[PDB]
Design a protein around this ligand. Structure first.
Ligand SMILES: COc1ccc(CC(=O)N2CCC[C@H](C(N)=O)C2)c(OC)c1
Ligand SMILES: [Zn+2]
Length: 139
């Protein structure tokens, strides 16, 4: 679990969005596993606007942060789950690191701010949904 709170927006994994997120929908994209809802309170977070390929993510299944080197946002095949059929997920960044299904929503940050959120995992891999291209989150 986890979310990004920036301005009057809440960014969550689309597959973990609540009834309230859908009732206050701003934008969603199944191919990216992202959903953004509107909030009444002003949010706590800054979005990175950079090309960093290193950063630190929070891993809930270890209660720890880990440093990672990650690939640039790209189209990656993701196996079928209870949430989606087998498909290519876009704007996904992979890194070697620990992840379990409940780790989705953990934030990845660099020195410039929030880069993205955990969205996939595998045997010693962790995948992050990028948010740096969503310029409208800042206005
Ligand atoms: C072994 O580590 C795992 C195993 C399985 C997963 C879960 C996973 O990847 N998905 C299930 C939820 C929707 C995801 C999507 N973006 O399509 C895909 C994991 O997530 C962090 C770590
Ligand atoms: Zn950066």
């Amino acid at each position: 679990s986890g979310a990004i709170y920036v301005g009057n927006y809440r960014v969550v994994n689309r597959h973990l969005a609540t009834h309230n997120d859908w009732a206050n929908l701003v934008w969603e994209d199944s191919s990216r596993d992202l959903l953004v809802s509107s909030t009444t309170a002003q949010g706590c977070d800054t979005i990175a606007r950079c090309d960093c390929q290193t950063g630190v993510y929070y891993c809930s299944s270890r209660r720890k942060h880990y440093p990672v080197s990650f690939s640039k946002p790209s189209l990656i095949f993701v196996e079928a789950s209870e949430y989606y059929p087998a498909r290519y997920q876009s704007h996904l960044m992979l890194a070697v690191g620990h992840s379990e299904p409940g780790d989705c929503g953990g934030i990845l940050r660099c020195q410039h701010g929030v880069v993205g959120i955990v969205s996939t995992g595998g045997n010693g891999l962790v995948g992050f949904a990028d948010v740096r291209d969503l310029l409208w989150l800042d206005e």
